[PDB]
Amino acid sequence: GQKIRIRLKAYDHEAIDASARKIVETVTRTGASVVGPVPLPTEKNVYCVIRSPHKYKDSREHFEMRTHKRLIDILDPTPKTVDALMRIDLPASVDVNIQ
Amino acid sequence: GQKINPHGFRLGITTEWKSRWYADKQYKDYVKEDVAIRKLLATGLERAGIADVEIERTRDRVRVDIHTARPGIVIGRRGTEADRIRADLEKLTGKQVQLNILEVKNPESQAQLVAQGVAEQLSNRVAFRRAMRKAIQSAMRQPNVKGIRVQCSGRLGGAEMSRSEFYREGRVPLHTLRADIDYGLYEAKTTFGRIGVKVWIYKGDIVG
Amino acid sequence: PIQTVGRRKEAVVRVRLVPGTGQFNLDGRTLENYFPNKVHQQLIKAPLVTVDRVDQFDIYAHLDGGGPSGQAGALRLAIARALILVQPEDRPALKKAGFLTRDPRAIERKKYGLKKARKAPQYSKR
């Protein structure tokens, strides 16, 4: 049968786990099967900058950008359940890609 | 360059980002727009007293929350200022905005606003010792405040030799990560140049 | 089944201790193909020489990550843990010989301003 994959991305892990609950709950309430939130490896982008505006090349500050990832695979997409997934209100902090 | 910015030091633990969105491809464009917005807002309600700007983005929705000491000047009773700002906002941004002009509960607990208040007094040639002590007393009376530090540096009193003075009351544990430190900085404008006002307000510990 | 994991540096090995006569299937190879170095062989089999069961078992191992010497050290740990499962009363002898410790020694991160973790740039007074 047809399957929908929801890739969820966020910077904070708390927002990502909270929004994986909201989706799983919505799917359970509409009676579909939900494989669940599978945790994918976090992406870490690292930037190194000189602290001073001029000449102090031995003073540096490292910055980080973590992106957390959660895969939610929903089986048995009842068209009511599909409509529900499209009508969930989720924080801007979380990016939702639905396939 | 001795002191790490207090906000950035705690940014993952005790304080939170001043803008919420996710974008991969649009990240650079989003930042450019944010720069434009915050420069348009920081040079508009100067005498309104702004503490925070939070920018939320999603699709085309641009939610701008402006925290201000008194919203009276930030919205005329005819909506005049809200309409003017939204006009320049949507113009600049390209999309639709919803100015959620809020207000701050305890103006005198807010380090950015306390910094603005000291700075404006110095702009009105008030003795800097006076303004420092005034801010200290006002903040410490309020219930959350467990300590405050205020620092002013520059040509204080119009002298030719830079002075850097600071007054402190209570605890200000800058090295403690769990300590809730509110930081504010404002640049007072004077006939002899600019003098920088920094305020640290300790409000207790956060465990999460 | 008996299964255990041993770790050393960046090498994780999964050992399957089964009864046998002293055979090693390290990813499909013997203990002379995978680990030609005699020092590494003496190391992998050191726990067995402490229990005295050098030829009383077969071992099957999955080796991944790290390098030859890391994987050798992870193997010795895994095996020693498997021996604790087979015969708990060997633990006083095996831990006294130190085979149950996970060696926590890892590569120190490179620090800015320095060429490596500790090596500093050449200094000059003038």
Next chain:
Amino acid sequence: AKKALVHKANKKPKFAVRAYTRCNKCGRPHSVYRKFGLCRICLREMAHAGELPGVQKSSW
């Protein structure tokens, strides 16, 4: 960053290779990161302010 140069860096050049990135906040030509569009100085400042989502101080 003379304002003439900031504008000239925003114009389309007549050759694709004359295009170069300038910091979106201050106009600094050197050390401009592609993903942020900011120079190392503005990056540090804004990141400390929490004005760059997901960007935090890095330790390991």
Next chain:
Amino acid sequence: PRSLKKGPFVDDHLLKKVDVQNEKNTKQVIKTWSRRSTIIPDFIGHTFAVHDGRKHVPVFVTEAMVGHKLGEFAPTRTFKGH
């Protein structure tokens, strides 16, 4: 070197001028700022005043100069010695 797929590079303007002159059988002095154009065999008898950043240097083309760039014959930096 410029790859053979693309052939030799010559600034369109420069080409135009030398063509005209040799088409109208004339060897005038051609004022040129183009350091970067290659010497085509069509140039063999022409004279070029090429910019060195300070002035124009007279370069008389010869058989042995073909395939060199024009700027190779107008030295930029002056060094008399220390």
Next chain:
Amino acid sequence: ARLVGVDLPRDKRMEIALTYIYGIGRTRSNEILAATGIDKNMRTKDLTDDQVTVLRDYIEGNLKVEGDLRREVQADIRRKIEIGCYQGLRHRRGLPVRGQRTKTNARTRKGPKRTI
């Protein structure tokens, strides 16, 4: 042995021995010995006059070496100098000709340090 005016080293393997000819390096040596079918592992001791003949015939046919090559190299440098190209001026000055640093280094061309 004797080959195109060059005395090959006493007992060196063929692939190395041939590099002593001013036009031949290790790649051209392996090429020449492959085309002639002489074992590159042979010593110069064991090289027969017949093999020397096949060697001379191939490299005099296809390859330009020794004097012929030196004359051509000198002619190429001389041309640059004569026509007055930038590289020719660099040859006159005894300075790097391939746009290398001169503030420091450039010693191979400049000779030993004549400290001032």
Next chain:
Amino acid sequence: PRKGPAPKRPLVNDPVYGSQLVTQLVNKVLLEGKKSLAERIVYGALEQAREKTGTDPVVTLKRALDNVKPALEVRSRRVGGATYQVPVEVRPDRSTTLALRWLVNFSRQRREKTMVERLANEILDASNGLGASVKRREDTHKMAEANRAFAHYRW
């Protein structure tokens, strides 16, 4: 070591010969962390020793060690601006460290084509008491005995 002596790292036992002397020797041959190369250099040298002397290699290595180990040593001390070579006793562990360092360093200076040859020949000569490492020991003692007068510093 202002706060006191630091612990010595345990040395393993050589799998082929079962002397910890041998693995100490490989840690002196060790360059650039290429332990496997140093290992086969030492094993090769002991095999060359075994075939040349007929006898057990570890036994002859120990004999060569005992003929190159210094018992008495000189430490320099500035005293009144004059500098005095002071005789000091060598503790056992330092003796073997010195002996092994001397053996390997003079083997590196030897003339034979390869390190396996140079090391084996230096070990054999030192077993007989002929080698450069033996001369070094004798010169170390010669300087100690010539400075016996300055022993009273006892530093």
Next chain:
RNA sequence: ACUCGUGAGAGACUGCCGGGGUCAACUCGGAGGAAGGUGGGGAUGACGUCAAGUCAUCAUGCCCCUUAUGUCCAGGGCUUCACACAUGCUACAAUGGCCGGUACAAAGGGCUGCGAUGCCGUGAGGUGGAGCGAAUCCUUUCAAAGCCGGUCUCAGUUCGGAUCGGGGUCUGCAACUCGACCCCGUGAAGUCGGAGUCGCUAGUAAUCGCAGAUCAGCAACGCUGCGGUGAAUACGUUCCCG
């Protein structure tokens, strides 16, 4: 089911046992435990100092320019070279060079971008484009040192790879000044470096590759980071520096 990824949690407290101790701090040793005594390493810089650095990121008092000290463009310069200093890289070789075979990583990057097969080139690369916004596909099934075998045999060499001649590739409107890379030839100094001087106390030093930011291309041997292989020594505080 084992790994692993990422969420929550446990665990180290001088907590326990023996001897030191002001029945004190704290200390020496032992048990248990993955770890033992702030376990290892980041982040974190008090009151001040040096009228330290930055008016060229930005901002700003005062002074100066406004037919120029503003501003557009082509060409040149920032790449000069009798020298000197400083930080590095590659070497002087056999614990090595070269050829053949074969084993074991981590971290990271990718959209007018990363690009697989196949085919054509000795090769840089060409052609064409599968598949991937990526734990999926590409960056070979991702390394080099390593291990096995053969060859060179102490020679300025089969060490070294500077320089210079010729022929090419790719990016770019364009590689003269002034790019990187490839192929053929060439084959410099250099035989372990004077007085003096630098770094490092264990996964450290030494050595080996890999990736990233900037970036059309690159002067990257730089910088930031990642793993592989892995030492020696520390009696001690007389002497030098802080």
